[PDB]
Amino acid sequence: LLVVGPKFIRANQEYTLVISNFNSQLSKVDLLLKLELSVLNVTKMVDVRRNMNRMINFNMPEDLTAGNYKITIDGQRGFSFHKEAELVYLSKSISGLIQVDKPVFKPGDTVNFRVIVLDTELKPPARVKSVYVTIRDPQRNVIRKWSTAKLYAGVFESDLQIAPTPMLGVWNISVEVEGEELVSKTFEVKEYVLSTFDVQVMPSVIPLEEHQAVNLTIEANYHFGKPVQGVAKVELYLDDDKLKLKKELTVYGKGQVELRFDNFAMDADQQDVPVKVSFVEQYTNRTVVKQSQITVYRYAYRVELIKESPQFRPGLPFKCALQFTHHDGTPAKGISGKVEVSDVRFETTTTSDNDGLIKLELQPSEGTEQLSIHFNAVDGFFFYEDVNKVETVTDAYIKLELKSPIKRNKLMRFMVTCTERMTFFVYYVMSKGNIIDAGFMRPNKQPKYLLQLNATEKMIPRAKILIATVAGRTVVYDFADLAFQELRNNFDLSIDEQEIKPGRQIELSMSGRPGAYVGLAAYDKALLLFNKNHDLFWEDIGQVFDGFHENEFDIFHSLGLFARTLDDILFDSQESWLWKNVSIGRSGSRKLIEVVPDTTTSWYLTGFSIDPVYGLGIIKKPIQFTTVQPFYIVENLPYSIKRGEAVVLQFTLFNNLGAEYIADVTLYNVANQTEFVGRPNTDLSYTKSVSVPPKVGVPISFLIKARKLGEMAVRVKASIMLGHETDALEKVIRVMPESLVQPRMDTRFFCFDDHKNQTFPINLDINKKADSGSTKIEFRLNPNLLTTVIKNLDHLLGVPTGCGEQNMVKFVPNILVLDYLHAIGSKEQHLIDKATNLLRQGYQNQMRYRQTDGSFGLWETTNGSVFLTAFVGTSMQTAVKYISDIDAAMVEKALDWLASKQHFSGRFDKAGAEYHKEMQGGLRNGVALTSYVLMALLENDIAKAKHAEVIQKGMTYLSNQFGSINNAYDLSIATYAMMLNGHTMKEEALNKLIDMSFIDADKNERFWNTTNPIETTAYALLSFVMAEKYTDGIPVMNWLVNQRYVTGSFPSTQDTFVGLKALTKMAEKISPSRNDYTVQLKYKKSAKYFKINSEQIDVENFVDIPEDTKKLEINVGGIGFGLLEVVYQFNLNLVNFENRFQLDLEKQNTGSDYELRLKVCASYIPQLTDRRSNMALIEVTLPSGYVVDRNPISEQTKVNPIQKTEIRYGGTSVVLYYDNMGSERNCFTLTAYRRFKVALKRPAYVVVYDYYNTNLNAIKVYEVDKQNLCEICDEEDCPAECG
Ligand SMILES: *[C@@H]1O[C@H](CO)[C@@H](O[C@@H]2O[C@H](CO)[C@@H](O)[C@H](O)[C@H]2NC(C)=O)[C@H](O)[C@H]1NC(C)=O
Ligand SMILES: *[C@@H]1O[C@H](CO)[C@@H](O)[C@H](O)[C@H]1NC(C)=O
Ligand SMILES: *[C@@H]1O[C@H](CO)[C@@H](O)[C@H](O)[C@H]1NC(C)=O
Ligand SMILES: *[C@@H]1O[C@H](CO)[C@@H](O)[C@H](O)[C@H]1NC(C)=O
Ligand code: NA
Ligand code: NA
Ligand code: NA
């Protein structure tokens, strides 16, 4: 008995079981058919006659939920039979696919993805108009939602920008239909900081015994792609002889090495020789070891026998071919020899054809027992394989062959061929996972049978057909697709039959259905290599085109069904390129034309098509080709250097042509930036030549000095055959001063209602110590507080910001900008877009600090902070105005956490580490923090409404504490909260705050002198604004405006958030409707003129560079608002200093000139009640040419752990973060390597400072063993004073 039914069950589809009775004992067989959570309970007493099959239909009830489903077939009466099958229920009629342009992404880049939705017919579902797609990070935060993502021909396409500092790990693209997951796909985001490199070792030509040698390509690269320089020790082991061949060579990224054998004579046609390569990186001595087995071959080709079927049929023709291939898998053409099969007296002397085949049609007589296929070539090569005859028990097969094409209402014709003379065989045809038709066929003891079937409409547009019989005591089958070509998407993609060449263009040719959507994608196998262990898109898409998917291929599994039979019967057995979508257009074809990227790599090109009617069309296999750059140059530069330092700029050349060529490398002196040591400053370029053999990196370098601070352009051109082949690069080195220059900005504003003339004099000479070189100074006119801010929105501070609080510079300022230019109703679209986009990036970024709590902490993982949770939570709520990507539930969770932290009395205490003493401290009854939390909730209407209880209790607390609030910081916040709340005590609170204010009468300044004067003065200004005290507010603004950092922000984080809010609020209310003024800048002997006449000025520069002068005169005349700024760029000497910190450095003895181990110890100097600092950072600066490795920090003290290590400026600077410091000694050791040759180097330094009060800091200088200029140069450019 043979029982075949579908394996998958649906809500309405008729389930058709087929039972075939080929048993010749009885005349009929009787069967019980149980089909059974307890939702289905259908049974049928069924009769099946001999030499026939029955088809039993089952109506599936509409209300079928998920559960456990079974089918049971029991032989009733005098016939034992028990068979059983698991039946998988399917909820949906549709299937989903996600295509991602890359498997791994880096911090910078964009994820592009497409969501494919096809129904059972493999076409866009008519019902499904849109989908729900959500992307979340490695910790499941929702970063991007598309609630209603429209399908266009079944496809939805979109992208996500990855943040500069994103969550590393596995991200999830999730697709949902009607609130149920249809498809999920992951992708990785990884860091390039994998400074470890990988070594490749492969033969450069395939080794033949006759060569008596092995030629090897050794290749060493970092993951990003840059070549590594080192020394490679190559060993090759001959163990039969106890031999060991050794060679060493310097490898500049890529090298060749020939190892010569002695009397090498293999016992077989093949021998594996083990090779070991130790690659020692240049200065670091980082060693990577790579091993492989290298096969030496006697012949340049191999033969295998490819047979039409594993065994032959005694009287019938037998088709096979001798397949010749080279040892790289490619066809080997023109290989000649003599084939002979003596059993049949067959013989032919011929050569392998263009496909590498020698085709054979042999003819065994029934007599013939086996076929001995001999091949002998004059080179001594021989190949023999025996073919045996078919043995019914193990060898029997049945095959299916389509004899006519397949059309709508026509007969389909098949030749069924079996090894056995058939008394029966069975067919089944299934479409959309159900058996549509089946038959019991009775050949009259015949090996061949012409099967004919009418194509029915339920078979349209795609069906398949299974045939099966019993031979011996095993079930043999075959199958075929039934693809109706007239109803198909006949999609095809092809590439022009030529060498595809980097930089040049190529033409893509494609054909299909006129309307059809086409999705294209190309991946380099380098990106596929590292992670092919996960699910490829092309395998997914190609599978769905066919059927279903460990162990071995089960045809029934894949066809969507199960088989069962008698117990004793067996069954037989680095940017994305060509991410384009297009349409096929009028003629049924399109030709897309594209530029091939300038890179050496191998491509995997893919294309699919979906037609709204004809559905899914796919290409057979992916298109493959390689692009090989003839010639290129790779740079290897330090991130930064300093003026006066002699630096070697090292490059490496690569030649991929067939011969050795002299390369000419030119380094340019761009805008007087570059001195070439040993030649005049007037020279604009320097050219050196070097020979470059094929496939061997050769180094080239230039000894230079930098003339100018800033960005040095590194402009190089290289060529080989009189310029028939060139490469160029445009790169950057940062030239820096000795001391981290600390810019001062003096600013004065004017706000003219009526036509006014005013003359502002400015003295400059408060600007020198012992050495200042020559401080450089610039005047700036700005129409708005936000012009420089908006300009600098991504880089507002000159201080690191890697902590939860600090990280809000990438978020809050964007809100300030947006909600200011909304209040003024600005139409400057570019500006709004910019702040909007960065706000989005900032959300992604802030999420790093969300805790399991639902709270926000100072570090990626730490106890939540009530300050931070109030700060972030409310700030995000505000941000819902401008971006839709904010997770509301996530915000609610944060604010609930915050609300639960409140005390019965209404008071808030700190939680987690104390990084900001003045805010978090509980030395003044918790007024600051309580006031802040209330303030933050008060600023947002939605939060106000949803946490009325917290505000009420909070305001009661303040009301109780008011008489004791003696600290201007606390009072300024409490007052502002009261103003927002309209608390009866607001007028009283503000009067008190005013009473504590200070004055500078000479400058018309009002401010508050606390240890954080910017914050408290800013909070006071908000209250002034809220109380409409505009005239008394200008002296306050006068002061604040003048504490601003060069970018328009304030030098620090909270200073910036409160400060800009306050300035911006005050600005909106005091500045005229229109700006119409003239500014005359008079200095020494000159006069510069500026005119501002628009109000919608904002993206406007009015920079100017005063020279080394003493005085300055600014005459303003007209109407409007403006900022008059002077910027100083001091160049103070680099000197040891300490104020309230102790910092000691010591260099440890490494025993290598190329390694620096710097021991750092810092501690705070406690005084009176001030025992610990705020959050403290250490920055370590390196000498020019040094780089830190992967984990540069060791021997950390444990008392007070480093909470964060950040490596920046190409491993040139290391920032370490602490919650705070006291008198404990916080030490660590930093390891760095000398990576670049630099002479006459300037000293480096280490800093420690209190983040929220940078006046408290220490700085210590250090020097590394000074390299000599005479060691640094190559003999050509070594100057006069050397030798
Ligand atoms: C690439 O596919 C996109 C859809 O992902 C096509 O853009 C759509 O074009 C149709 C025109 O019928 C509009 O109704 C949609 O609004 C467009 N969608 C979006 C979001 O752009 C686009 O035409 C395709 N590209 C080409 C040139 O063939
Ligand atoms: C991706 O999303 C779905 C549902 O959210 C889930 O099945 C799957 O586990 C997720 N993948 C990962 C890596 O968490
Ligand atoms: C092995 O390398 C050397 C140096 O390139 C070359 O001359 C020799 O021909 C190579 N062997 C083969 C068989 O290519
Ligand atoms: C690496 O080895 C070289 C050569 O032996 C030596 O000069 C150098 O000191 C070593 N570097 C380190 C980091 O130990
Ligand atoms: Na806190
Ligand atoms: Na001042
Ligand atoms: Na030096």
UniProtKB/Swiss-Prot annotation:
GO molecular function, a single term: endopeptidase inhibitor activity
Cysteines paired by S-S bonds: C1161-C1227, C1270-C1282, C1273-C1278
Post-translational modification: In the hemolymph, the full-length protein is cleaved by an unknow protease into a 75kDa N-terminal (TEP1-N) chain and an 80kDa C-terminal (TEP1-C) chain which remain non-covalently linked. The TEP1-C chain contains the thioester bond which covalently binds to the pathogen surface. Cleavage is induced by bacterial infection or aseptic wound injury. During embryonic and pupal development, the cleaved form is the predominant form. N-glycosylated.
Main location: secreted
Presence of the UniProt keyword Signal in the record: yes
CDD domains: A2M_2 (cd02897)
Annotated SUPFAM superfamilies: Alpha-macroglobulin receptor domain, Terpenoid cyclases/Protein prenyltransferases
Induction annotation: By bacterium E.coli infection.
Stretches assigned to coiled coil: none
Oligomeric and partner information: Heterodimer of a TEP1-N chain and an TEP1-C chain non-covalently linked. Forms a complex composed of TEP1-N and TEP1-C heterodimer, LRIM1 and APL1C; the interaction stabilizes TEP1-N and TEP1-C heterodimer, prevents its binding to tissues while circulating in the hemolymph and protects the thioester bond from hydrolysis. Mature TEP1 and to a lesser extent full-length TEP1 interact with SPCLIP1; the interaction is induced by microbial infection.
Classification of source organism: Eukaryota, Metazoa, Ecdysozoa, Arthropoda, Hexapoda
One Pfam family from the record: TEP1_CUB2
InterPro entries given in the database record: A-macroglobulin_rcpt-bd, A-macroglobulin_rcpt-bd_sf, A2M/Complement_sys, A2M_N_BRD, A2M_TED, Alpha-macroglob_thiol-ester_cl, Alpha-macroglobulin_TED, Ig-like_fold
Isoglutamyl cysteine thioester (Cys-Gln) crosslink site(s): C803-Q806
Cellular component, GO annotation: extracellular space
Function, as annotated: Plays an essential role in the innate immune response to bacteria and protozoa infection. After proteolytic cleavage, the protein C-terminus binds covalently through a thioester bond to the pathogen surface resulting in pathogen clearance either by melanization or lysis. Initiate the recruitment and activation of a cascade of proteases, mostly of CLIP-domain serine proteases, which leads to the proteolytic cleavage of the prophenoloxidase (PPO) into active phenoloxidase (PO), the rate-limiting enzyme in melanin biosynthesis.
Protein name: Thioester-containing protein 1 allele S1
Gene Ontology BP, a term: immune system process
